[PDB]
Design a protein around this ligand. Structure first.
Ligand SMILES: Nc1ncnc2c1ncn2[C@@H]1O[C@H](COP(=O)(O)OP(=O)(O)OP(=O)(O)O)[C@@H](O)[C@H]1O
Ligand SMILES: Nc1ncnc2c1ncn2[C@@H]1O[C@H](COP(=O)(O)OP(=O)(O)OP(=O)(O)O)[C@@H](O)[C@H]1O
Ligand SMILES: Nc1ncnc2c1ncn2[C@@H]1O[C@H](COP(=O)(O)OP(=O)(O)OP(=O)(O)O)[C@@H](O)[C@H]1O
Ligand SMILES: Nc1ncnc2c1ncn2[C@@H]1O[C@H](COP(=O)(O)OP(=O)(O)OP(=O)(O)O)[C@@H](O)[C@H]1O
Ligand SMILES: Nc1ncnc2c1ncn2[C@@H]1O[C@H](COP(=O)(O)OP(=O)(O)OP(=O)(O)O)[C@@H](O)[C@H]1O
Ligand SMILES: [Mg+2]
Ligand SMILES: [Mg+2]
Ligand SMILES: [Mg+2]
Ligand SMILES: [Mg+2]
Ligand SMILES: [Mg+2]
Lengths: 267, 268, 258, 266, 270
């Protein structure tokens, strides 16, 4: 099964102190703080892809955290139901095998597991190891490349059967071509009929999305389709540079991207 | 089973030299001005079984106050009253070489009921059952997440049967929801009849506490209940932002919070 | 984990005075005759993970048997064997002040996966998605069951939890909840429905405090082809309260409107 | 605390038959019926008197006479000091749980915490984020019957008095909670105080220092439980005034069930 | 969404024999009904809400007829049939209407942008529509002229799936596709797009039987087997092509085989 997600006039603070103060001669104590999310409105139907974009600190992860209940609204309405699956910006590797890391407590299913490792391009990493997917890794994933950790992390999120998938920029340690292929095979094909929210800065991902949400300083800059945004603002393509770009990338990230490029052509 | 904690006009210096210095028509000197006390004129009283929340910004002397109760820091003036054994959970989550079970038990006599009640309240059942070796898998001084280490370190402090529990911000590496759940199940439920002092910046924790103590640069800013303080200072919610906020968190703290979030939606 | 439940030659009195008099009795006298035991010579065994259906006419002692297991009622004679935690769903659908989450969680620790599973099995997913507690009779019934089912226990005692539901919703929840989600748990279900007795590993029929039948449904069908609604303690719809009737109707409307 | 003495006490609820009893032979008092007749007992400081009898026997009326609502036409009543009264009716004031328990007298944190412990109100208070200071209205809406019963007893017990009059305060509780609170509150916390408890429970009679059985306003039995067992091995639910569960209101049965549910869920 | 239940169902296509079976049922004795042969005899199965039933069996076993009975064209002479809601039907015959591809898929029912897009993706029609100059608005005549067999099959499936129904009856919709495309569409359409819908799929593919929640094997009008694929394989380790109704490639028409070849060519030439 899958779920709708609806937000109506949502405002939220990470600080518990400022939240209560917002819910209240005159005075205005709320001003001493700043809302992380302000007047958020959207509705995504069952099985749709919502792409969320915006510059650093805009509140993209925070929006996901609010769906997950870590951040609570001080105003407005959130509607969604069922199980959540989360893929974080941080790729987390569990002590155990690659199979164990993907399955993560869920019952093993042959067809599902194979679909997922195929979609996330782990077949060559899963067979060309000493003892297949039974090789033991530790917490952190020292013996794995950044690209491997990202793909295992995505595989784990996609293997879980859920009503809502929250994907926080899962391709950032991958090279361009691998990102394009996995977006298509995983997010567009394997997850085709699951409601999903993807944090991304890729214009292509926005193009394929059913709905887009541009966040600016916690506020809704634009909600609708990419075509509508392009028609109103033919310049926006340039503002997409002011989101997540190279040279601002850390050292290990660039090295991971290079390693993923090397993997492609070494075959 | 549990102790009262009293402090009367307590002033203290970490530096022994400035402490010794501490204890107009005519000529006078004032050498004690050369040093600043870490704690100054501290007064509070916590009854048996009560919860005291201690808050304040970085460097205000919260850990130092706990250190004083432990006898690491010594008073130059005033009296400190507390009896029985002390248990201490630090900001630093310490992992002993050995197993998880031995890490929680750590010398203290083994009891089946108590141990299982502790690992439940600290949400360690799922961590213990997942490993092939159960709670008999070996650890160094790592292949553990920040959240796991924090949970084990709390479990250890809680397992010990003591008259006074000192909890120095034990939830920092946990996500919001896990923190809420463990505060309720461990601090509030399993430890309900125990005297405990909790260093925290969370409004909810201050609300639940019987008494609160707000420290400012080593001095008592407020002592009483949270309601009394909110009634006196409708501002205070804003002051609590200037305590321990996300903007200062290190990378490994931020990432520990994130994988605790992952754990909830990926495991069990 | 889960537990076995054993009852050997059990007799019990709700009135302590008559209970203690049976113990004192344990030319001649028989002062114990002045009272009447609520349960008399009860014998059954339910294996770990099995379902016991308890049926019988109004006042036969179905709830009291559950109260005895919970220790509210004490035996004057015999042995009762059960270990671990008990979870109880009453005929009364209790709603606490607080949220729906707080009502379901009710003093045990929150677990995300388990929570979502229980919401699914009790058909509360749409209800929950739509705040202090407003509710339909059906919603109250489902939340109250969800609470009992959410608690991790060795033994589940379910006292007629489906009464305020329409036939179709009761069937679906008995399947998803009692049969599937709770498949490996020891459960005792007070019910009057043929389908439930068919599915149970064992059935106990009570009559005026005594054991009328113990065994399987198929064994009962041979010995009693003459169905009795009175003896089984079946629903008398014309005697249902206006509240109960309208709850059943509302649940029927819900199926076809939402 | 106080002693309670009653010597040859007879009383009428109606003022008319009062002085008529206090008076050719004529007896106009006969067309009235005395609610209590020739009552005799003596309970020492710190002792528990258990009072039992069928419905309408005069158990509550006896408490009412001690409180002064009912005046004797004959005999002597001796008791001194303040009285605390816990009624069959569980009453809730406008205001918070704390204020409901405190009820006017000066706050004492130690005494208060002891009372809420003994009356099992700790989970009730700690559940709310507003704790002790969340408001309730008159009637006790949004509270369960079990909670009202516990708050009402808490109020009665918190009050410092020489004599405590407890009129069947457990009726809306399940068997187990009644047993636990009888023990922790009436038997332990109030062990130093003189108390009179109207009850039907055999267990309460055993723990009492003295028991008084009423029947139609007259003293059927006065003495210990052991003496009563000797004299009367034939237990009678009717005579002891045992609760007929089938005669319970929907709200009372549902209260008991909610208390049962509270125990196994929390 | 709906449940489908059949219990001891018998049916005749010929009305005369159906009425004869019922008239002799209520009533020295006679048995006139033996003169006819029922298309379906003693049918028993159950599929729950949102589940996939796979129906297999040899040619003439009565697979389409069972679908025809659910649709009310064939009437039961005996037994219980339970189902509710709207039915959508995809036939072995790929029907093309006069009109555009859009009109063909929509089929009068209201247009919904997202639903339409979801269906054309799941049925692999995105390439086809875009490849045409006027896109969705290219005019098709009745029957077959302009489109390939694979295209006709995908449009016909898309129409069935676009309709909002509580029961989807899919009578061997992939026969004119190559193996790889059939695999992909069974996954993307039948399993994912229709994941929460009650569906009955007539098929001869082991893969489909494996994925189904329940299978129903038909043999000369009667229930040969009902259960899961695991239960079947445990109770029958010997595979029979004839019994399962496995479509023999030799017994395919020239147009069918060439449609399969065209689909393979499409994959490698675009
Ligand atoms: N766990 C948290 N607790 C408190 N504040 C947080 C937390 N996570 C993020 N924030 C705050 O929320 C605000 C928005 O940050 P957020 O991480 O949601 O931005 P983002 O759009 O995901 O940025 P980026 O593109 O770099 O990932 C920031 O001020 C940040 O400090
Ligand atoms: N072990 C120590 N020896 C000497 N000085 C110390 C020691 N620990 C803390 N201090 C000093 O005491 C002062 C107060 O520090 P303390 O750690 O008690 O503040 P805090 O309230 O716990 O701050 P934080 O919230 O960052 O933990 C600081 O000047 C600090 O350098
Ligand atoms: N809490 C109680 N205290 C005293 N007597 C009780 C109590 N509960 C039930 N009884 C009595 O026990 C006897 C059996 O009642 P019980 O409620 O167990 O029957 P039941 O089978 O559950 O009937 P129903 O179908 O109406 O639920 C009755 O006489 C009833 O009055
Ligand atoms: N306030 C009153 N004013 C006048 N008569 C009263 C009053 N209260 C009780 N009575 C009468 O006193 C008689 C005895 O009743 P009482 O309430 O003392 O019996 P009880 O033993 O408490 O019965 P129960 O077990 O039902 O509580 C009854 O006739 C009753 O009507
Ligand atoms: N519309 C109809 N009217 C009358 N008889 C029919 C009709 N359709 C099919 N039949 C007959 O019903 C019987 C069963 O044929 P049916 O088409 O249902 O088998 P099938 O399993 O679908 O075979 P196939 O694999 O070739 O499609 C045959 O005798 C057939 O002639
Ligand atoms: Mg982010
Ligand atoms: Mg510190
Ligand atoms: Mg009952
Ligand atoms: Mg009375
Ligand atoms: Mg056919």
């Amino acid at each position: 099964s899958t779920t709708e997600v609806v937000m109506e006039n949502v405002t939220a603070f990470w600080e518990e102190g400022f939240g209560e103060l917002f819910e209240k001669s005159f005075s205005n104590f709320s001003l001493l703080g700043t809302p992380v999310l302000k007047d958020i409105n959207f509705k995504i139907e069952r099985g749709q892809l919502l792409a969320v974009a915006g510059s650093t600190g805009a509140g993209k992860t925070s929006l996901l955290m609010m769906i997950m209940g870590e951040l609570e609204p001080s105003e407005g309405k959130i509607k969604h139901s069922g199980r959540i699956s989360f893929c974080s910006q941080f790729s987390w590797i569990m002590p155990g095998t690659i199979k164990e890391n993907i399955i993560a407590g869920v019952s093993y299913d042959e067809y599902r597991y194979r679909s997922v490792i195929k979609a996330c391009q782990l077949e060559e990493d899963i067979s060309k190891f000493a003892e297949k997917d039974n090789i033991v890794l530790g917490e952190g994933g020292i013996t794995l490349s950044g690209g491997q950790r990202a793909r295992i992390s995505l595989a784990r999120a996609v293997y879980k059967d859920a009503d809502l998938y929250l994907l926080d920029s899962p391709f950032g340690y991958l090279d361009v071509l691998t990102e394009k292929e996995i977006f298509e095979s995983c997010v567009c094909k394997l997850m085709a009929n699951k409601t999903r929210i993807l944090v991304t800065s890729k214009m292509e991902h926005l193009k394929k999305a059913d709905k887009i949400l541009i966040l600016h300083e916690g506020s809704s800059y634009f909600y609708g389709t990419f075509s509508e945004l392009q028609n109103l603002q033919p310049d926006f393509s340039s503002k997409l540079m002011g989101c997540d770009s190279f040279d601002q990338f850390s050292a290990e990230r660039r090295n991971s991207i290079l390693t993923e490029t090397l993997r492609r052509f070494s075959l």
